[PDB]
Design a protein around this motif. Structure first.
Motif, PDB file in Angstrom:
ATOM      1  N   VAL A 134      -2.986  -0.966  -9.182  1.00 52.26           N
ATOM      2  CA  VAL A 134      -2.606  -2.366  -9.027  1.00 52.26           C
ATOM      3  C   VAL A 134      -1.683  -2.488  -7.824  1.00 52.26           C
ATOM      4  CG1 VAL A 134      -1.811  -4.435 -10.209  1.00 52.26           C
ATOM      5  CG2 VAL A 134      -2.674  -2.505 -11.543  1.00 52.26           C
ATOM      6  N   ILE A 135      -1.936  -3.493  -6.984  1.00 54.04           N
ATOM      7  CA  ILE A 135      -1.201  -3.672  -5.736  1.00 54.04           C
ATOM      8  C   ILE A 135      -0.997  -5.164  -5.503  1.00 54.04           C
ATOM      9  CG2 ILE A 135      -3.172  -3.844  -4.167  1.00 54.04           C
ATOM     10  CD1 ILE A 135      -1.635  -1.999  -2.244  1.00 54.04           C
ATOM     11  N   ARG A 136      -0.045  -5.491  -4.630  1.00 51.58           N
ATOM     12  CA  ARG A 136       0.190  -6.876  -4.249  1.00 51.58           C
ATOM     13  C   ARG A 136      -0.981  -7.417  -3.438  1.00 51.58           C
ATOM     14  NH1 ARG A 136       3.660  -8.861  -1.303  1.00 51.58           N
ATOM     15  NH2 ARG A 136       4.390  -7.141   0.020  1.00 51.58           N
ATOM     16  N   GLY A 137      -1.078  -8.746  -3.387  1.00 52.63           N
ATOM     17  CA  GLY A 137      -2.201  -9.394  -2.735  1.00 52.63           C
ATOM     18  C   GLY A 137      -2.253  -9.227  -1.229  1.00 52.63           C
ATOM     19  N   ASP A 138      -1.110  -8.998  -0.580  1.00 52.64           N
ATOM     20  CA  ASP A 138      -1.105  -8.923   0.878  1.00 52.64           C
ATOM     21  C   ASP A 138      -1.680  -7.605   1.390  1.00 52.64           C
ATOM     22  OD1 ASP A 138       1.036  -7.799  -0.412  1.00 52.64           O
ATOM     23  OD2 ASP A 138       2.411  -8.020   1.286  1.00 52.64           O
ATOM     24  N   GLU A 139      -1.376  -6.490   0.727  1.00 56.67           N
ATOM     25  CA  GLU A 139      -1.759  -5.178   1.239  1.00 56.67           C
ATOM     26  C   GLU A 139      -3.193  -4.786   0.897  1.00 56.67           C
ATOM     27  OE1 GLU A 139       0.929  -4.866  -1.207  1.00 56.67           O
ATOM     28  OE2 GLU A 139       2.663  -5.140   0.111  1.00 56.67           O
ATOM     29  N   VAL A 140      -4.004  -5.699   0.359  1.00 54.86           N
ATOM     30  CA  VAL A 140      -5.409  -5.373   0.141  1.00 54.86           C
ATOM     31  C   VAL A 140      -6.119  -5.168   1.472  1.00 54.86           C
ATOM     32  CG1 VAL A 140      -7.474  -6.001  -1.137  1.00 54.86           C
ATOM     33  CG2 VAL A 140      -5.240  -6.794  -1.913  1.00 54.86           C
ATOM     34  N   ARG A 141      -5.758  -5.947   2.493  1.00 53.95           N
ATOM     35  CA  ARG A 141      -6.243  -5.661   3.837  1.00 53.95           C
ATOM     36  C   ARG A 141      -5.636  -4.376   4.383  1.00 53.95           C
ATOM     37  NH1 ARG A 141      -1.771  -4.967   7.298  1.00 53.95           N
ATOM     38  NH2 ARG A 141      -0.105  -6.231   6.366  1.00 53.95           N
ATOM     39  N   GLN A 142      -4.444  -4.010   3.905  1.00 54.12           N
ATOM     40  CA  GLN A 142      -3.753  -2.828   4.407  1.00 54.12           C
ATOM     41  C   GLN A 142      -4.420  -1.534   3.959  1.00 54.12           C
ATOM     42  OE1 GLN A 142       0.495  -2.819   4.043  1.00 54.12           O
ATOM     43  NE2 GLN A 142       0.618  -0.679   3.379  1.00 54.12           N
ATOM     44  N   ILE A 143      -5.115  -1.544   2.826  1.00 56.19           N
ATOM     45  CA  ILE A 143      -5.778  -0.330   2.318  1.00 56.19           C
ATOM     46  C   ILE A 143      -7.139  -0.262   3.003  1.00 56.19           C
ATOM     47  CG2 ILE A 143      -6.620  -1.492   0.190  1.00 56.19           C
ATOM     48  CD1 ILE A 143      -6.099   1.260  -1.195  1.00 56.19           C
ATOM     49  N   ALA A 144      -7.133   0.292   4.210  1.00 56.43           N
ATOM     50  CA  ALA A 144      -8.327   0.467   5.017  1.00 56.43           C
ATOM     51  C   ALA A 144      -8.205   1.766   5.796  1.00 56.43           C
ATOM     52  CB  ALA A 144      -8.532  -0.708   5.987  1.00 56.43           C
ATOM     53  N   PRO A 145      -9.327   2.395   6.144  1.00 56.27           N
ATOM     54  CA  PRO A 145      -9.258   3.637   6.922  1.00 56.27           C
ATOM     55  C   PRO A 145      -8.617   3.412   8.282  1.00 56.27           C
ATOM     56  CG  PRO A 145     -11.499   2.794   6.843  1.00 56.27           C
ATOM     57  CD  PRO A 145     -10.717   2.028   5.825  1.00 56.27           C
ATOM     58  N   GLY A 146      -7.854   4.407   8.729  1.00 58.02           N
ATOM     59  CA  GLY A 146      -7.271   4.382  10.055  1.00 58.02           C
ATOM     60  C   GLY A 146      -5.955   3.640  10.169  1.00 58.02           C
ATOM     61  N   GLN A 147      -5.971   2.336   9.901  1.00 61.90           N
ATOM     62  CA  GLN A 147      -4.785   1.514  10.111  1.00 61.90           C
ATOM     63  C   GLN A 147      -3.651   1.943   9.188  1.00 61.90           C
ATOM     64  OE1 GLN A 147      -4.721  -2.500   8.934  1.00 61.90           O
ATOM     65  NE2 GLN A 147      -5.709  -2.163   6.948  1.00 61.90           N
ATOM     66  N   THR A 148      -2.425   1.835   9.693  1.00 57.83           N
ATOM     67  CA  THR A 148      -1.246   2.301   8.981  1.00 57.83           C
ATOM     68  C   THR A 148      -0.786   1.264   7.957  1.00 57.83           C
ATOM     69  OG1 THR A 148       0.990   3.179   9.262  1.00 57.83           O
ATOM     70  CG2 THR A 148       0.317   1.364  10.699  1.00 57.83           C
TER      71      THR A 148
END
Lengths: 50, 49
Positions: A36-50
């Motif tokens: 479970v994670i906050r709504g903003d970091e769903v884009r953050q969980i992606a390959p490569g990007q920090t």
């Protein structure tokens, strides 16, 4: 295909493969993850990007 | 001498020093810069004929 209409997912980003073509090829040792994670970091969980 | 001097061109990147690109930005973007330099230097080597 059943995972496309029953639950309208907010995001569906199929990396390294075409989402529609997943039916016609046999993979090896599928792994599933869950948390479970906050709504903003769903884009953050992606390959490569920090 | 021309072959030696060729080692100081961008070939289409932001700079022409591997350490600079490595220490100035993350790998998942610097890969394309390293690709540009590597392609340019392979052409410079193949132009042996």
């Amino acid at each position: 295909s059943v995972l496309y209409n029953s639950a309208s997912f907010s995001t569906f980003k199929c990396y390294g493969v075409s989402p529609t073509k997943l039916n016609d090829l046999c993979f090896t040792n599928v792994y599933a993850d869950s948390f479970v994670i906050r709504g903003d970091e769903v884009r953050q969980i992606a390959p490569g990007q920090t | 001498n021309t072959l030696v001097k060729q080692l100081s061109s961008n070939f289409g990147a932001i700079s022409s020093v591997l350490n600079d690109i490595l220490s100035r930005l993350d790998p998942p973007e610097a890969e394309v810069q390293i690709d540009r330099l590597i392609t340019g230097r392979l052409q410079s080597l193949q132009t042996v004929t």
